[PDB]
Structure formats: C-alpha cells, structure tokens
C-alpha cells in the first residue's frame, strides 16, 4: 500500500555489538552503538480487531537458536512456519497498511541514515541492591561516631501514620527489567553485515538482543514518508545499495581530513 | 436622546419626519422626533437639518434620513416602537458612516 | 459545666430542643390568597 500520513512501520530485532566513536563535519565527537540484525523474520500477524482494536500486531523473531532446547509447542509453531527457532520474539504495533506476510526477512536497510529510533531492552542486571545504588540516597557520614549505619536508608516513615506507605523506596532488585531509549539518531548503515549505528547508549548488556522501531516521540512523527515502506526489499529494486549509507554530517572513514576556513 | 448624543450624529445629511397628528398610531414617531430634536443631538453637527412634515391626510407616518455614505434610511413607523426606531437608527447610521 | 449565661449560645438538652421545635409559631394560612381573589 502507499504511505498514509498517520502510518507506522514494523520494527527489528537486533543484537548489541559494542560501541564506537564517530565524528561529525563540524568537528564534534559522538559515540555510537552498533546493532547488528542477525536473522529477523516476521512470524505471525494478528489483525486489528483481534489485538488492540486499534492497531494490528506483527510478531518478529530474533537470532537463531538450537532446536533441542526449546519446547514441543514452540517447535511446532516454527515447523508450520518453516523457519528455525528464534531466541527472542517481540510484538510490534502496526497500522494495517504496513502489514507484511509472516515468513518474510527484515534487513538493516529498513532504517535510513538520519532518522530517529527507539530501542528497547532488558537493562543490565545488578541484582539485589542497597538503597544507595538502587535509589541514590546519601548514606550517613562515615566517621563522626556513626555506628553500623554508613549506608542504611535511615527513617522509612512517619511516626503517626503507623505503617510504611506503598511507594516507599527500599533495598531490592535492580536492573533486569525493560527500558526504552528514545530520540536516537541513526548515523550510519552497513549493508554487508547489516549493522545500524545509533547515537549514544542503548540499554542492555553488549551481545544482548534488542528491539528497534521508529521514534514515537512527537517531533519525529511524520518522518516515515521518505522510508522504504511496507519495509525494505533487497529483491525488488534490482539495484544494490552501497556498502555503507551515511548521514550528511558524518565525517567518513576516508575523506579530505577537515580544514576550517 | 442620550444614546444618540453619545454616537456622534455628524455623519448625517438631512433628517425629515412625516407624520399625521390625528392618527392613533403616531406616538412612536413623535417620540423619535423629540429624541432627534434634543439639544445634544442637534448640536453634535450643524450641517444637519431636521424637518417636521405635518399633514392631516397622509395617514402613514414615516421617518427618512440621508447620510454621507450616499445612504438613505427610511423606516415607516406604523407598528414600530420608539426605541426600536432609535436602536435601528443607532446600529444602522453609526456602523455605516 | 457552663454558667447559666454565656457568650457562645449553649446547646440545649435534647428534650428542650424538641420542646422548642414543637412550639414554633405557625402563621395562619388563608383558604384563598387575598391577591388571587377579586
């Protein structure tokens, strides 16, 4: 279908590689996160009325895993599909003009350089944590005669209330949980290895699986019109893409070596 | 007569009032006459003449007012009330002028 | 315990209140209003 104004694309499931510096023609330094798309397929399609009653849902698979360590149910689900099992599976909200056919590949070219994306992942698990690391309470002073208190939360409530309120910040589990980074510019796309270079830090540990989509932030809402939409299809155009696509502010790995004037 | 004074009658050329004293319906037009004839409205502009036409037979009271928009406003008071004539006069002759 | 005379109006024993409420003035009500008469 052609592109309608309030439309929204499918996303990807990528793999956080590491981080790299990158420079812009104005001289500034940036740091970027490499996200490699490994094997990414749309798995099933839930219609609009069967899911949110608003937007359709596409279920996308992440990187391939071993057959032997999954469950009868799941293996049946892929058997009837004809893909190998995917590690991670996420659900994307999609306007019904954007829908693809389950069993379809998705590539890194799906995002064009200069754009903004949203990256969701499980954050680094820091385990059961104290009040200072988990919340950021100061402790009590170290030396001036404090006994066994140098870290503890202090008073946890009021005298009269006689209970402790439900929101009360207290020691506990920190970090294995899902967060989303917003407003991330994409700088560069490596088409050979399927690598997206995004701006700044993306939540999760390196080598973990990640969920990308276009930014739902307000200022970027209609950016989609210039993008390969239903998605990108390396088949159809019958022209190859360059090894790399860059933003126009990006100093390239080879270049004039900038001289101000 | 005050609301006419506040409104700066100077945009008017000539005001005549034609009415028939022995008819039962003419009190309204008369009230209009004494409202426009008052000293305030009369002295707002000296370029405007006020003429009272008095006939026994004409049988239809009328008010005719010309002003410098090239405009001619004619209201035939028959069943029309005084302050309806003066309100019509105000919004008609002020907003245009 | 309060003095007999006080500044603050002095809540009554309930039974006294009932007395007060029963003994209120009732104005006479004409059968037909004199205005709606001729």
């Amino acid at each position: 279908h052609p592109w309608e104004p309030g439309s929204s694309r499918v996303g990807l499931i990528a793999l956080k590689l590491g981080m790299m510096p990158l420079w812009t023609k104005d001289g500034q330094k940036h740091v970027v996160t490499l996200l490699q798309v490994q094997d990414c397929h749309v798995l099933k399609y839930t219609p609009k009325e069967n899911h949110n009653g608003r937007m359709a849902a596409l279920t996308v698979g992440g990187k391939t895993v071993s057959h032997f360590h999954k469950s009868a149910s799941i293996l049946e689900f892929y058997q009837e599909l004809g893909l190998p099992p995917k590690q991670k599976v996420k659900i994307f909200n999609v306007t019904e003009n954007a829908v693809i056919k389950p069993g379809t590949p998705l590539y890194a070219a799906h995002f064009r350089p200069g754009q903004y994306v949203d990256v969701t992942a499980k954050t680094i698990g820091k385990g059961f944590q104290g009040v200072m690391r988990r919340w950021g309470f100061k402790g009590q002073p170290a030396t001036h005669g404090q006994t066994k208190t140098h870290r503890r939360p202090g008073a946890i409530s009021t005298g009269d209330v006689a209970r402790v309120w439900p929101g009360t910040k207290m020691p506990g589990q920190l970090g294995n949980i899902d967060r989303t980074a917003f407003g991330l510019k994409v700088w560069r796309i490596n088409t050979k290895h399927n690598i997206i270079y995004v701006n700044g830090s993306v939540p999760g540990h390196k080598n973990c699986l990640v969920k990308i989509k276009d930014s739902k932030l307000p200022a970027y809402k209609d950016f989609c019109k210039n993008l390969p939409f239903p998605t990108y299809f390396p088949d159809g155009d019958e022209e190859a893409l360059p090894e790399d696509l860059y933003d126009e502010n990006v100093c390239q790995p080879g270049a004039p070596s900038i001289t101000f004037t | 007569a005050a609301a006419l004074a506040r409104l700066g009658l100077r945009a008017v050329k000539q005001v005549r009032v034609q009415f028939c004293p022995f008819e039962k319906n003419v009190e309204s037009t008369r009230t209009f006459l004494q409202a426009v004839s008052s000293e305030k409205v009369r002295c707002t502009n000296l370029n405007c003449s006020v003429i009272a036409d008095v006939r026994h037979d004409g049988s239809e009271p009328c008010v005719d007012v010309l002003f410098g928009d090239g405009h001619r406003l004619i209201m035939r008071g028959a069943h029309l009330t005084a302050q309806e004539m003066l309100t019509a006069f105000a919004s008609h002759i002020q907003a245009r002028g | 315990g309060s003095k007999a005379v006080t500044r603050h109006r002095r809540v009554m024993h309930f039974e006294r209140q009932k007395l007060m409420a029963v003994t209120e003035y009732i104005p006479p009500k004409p059968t037909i209003n004199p205005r709606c008469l001729p």
């Binding site: - | 001619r72 406003l73 004619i74 209201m75 008071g77 028959a78 069943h79 029309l80 | 205005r35 709606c36």
Partner: protein, 162 residues
Amino acid sequence: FREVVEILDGKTTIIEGRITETPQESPNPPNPTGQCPICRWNLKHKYNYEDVLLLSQFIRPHGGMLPRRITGLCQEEHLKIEECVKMAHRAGLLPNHRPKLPEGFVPKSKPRLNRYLTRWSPRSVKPIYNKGHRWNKVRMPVGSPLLKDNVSYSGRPLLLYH
C-alpha cells in the same frame, strides 16, 4: 405578535412593522372571577417544571421569559413560572425554543448529559469535594423552593436537598 421587517434595496433601507394573528384566551375559564391567568384556570400549585404545554405560553420564540406586565401573572406565580422554564430548558424540553445558529450545530460536544430538576446552572457549580459527616453534611439542591407549595398526593413534603 408583530414582526419587524428590514429590506435592503439600492442603498435604501426599509424598516416596517407588520401585524400577524394572535391566538386568544380559550373561551371558558373555571374561575372567571379569578385575577391572575394561572389562577382562573385553577392551575395554582399544580403545574410543575414538567408541564410544557403550559410553560411554552409564556416565553419568546428564542427561549427567554416574557415580561410580567404583558402576561399579567400574579408576581409570585411569575417567579414560579420563571424557575420552571429555566429548569425545563436545562432538562432538555423545549428544543425548538433555542436561537438558530447555522455554524454551531456542526461542532459536536460530549453528548448532552441528561438532567432534570436542576436549580442552578451547570457552569456555576463547584464540585463538593468535602461531603462531610453525618452531623455536618453538604446537601445537593434538587428542584426549587419556589415550588415547595405544589400539592403533594403522597402527603410527604417534596425532598429539596440530597
């Protein structure tokens, strides 16, 4: 009922009064000696906000109350009928008596909340956040005290506050 007509022809404007036909008081009243229009029809303490056939007789095509000296109502009853008319407008009866405005029918607002017996205007009432206990309690007015003299067939006085 006297319509006032205005015409624009060639930089000349004509304004004229024109008389139409007024319906007349129904031939035979029950209490001809009776002074005030409500009373000679024996409607005193009988009509409510609900009785539209009665209320629509005193008002303007645009929904506003007629003046008292024209209608001839006994002062008290004039006030009662005014209360009732307000209450009936608010209740969503007399939908034909609004002023007609070709633009404003188009811009929908949240479908009109059905209400009845409303003493105040909706825009003017603060929500009561504090209620209050059994002994000091904030009560919400329903109907108007002007009608507290309507005949009660049950015998229990109408409940004006809850």
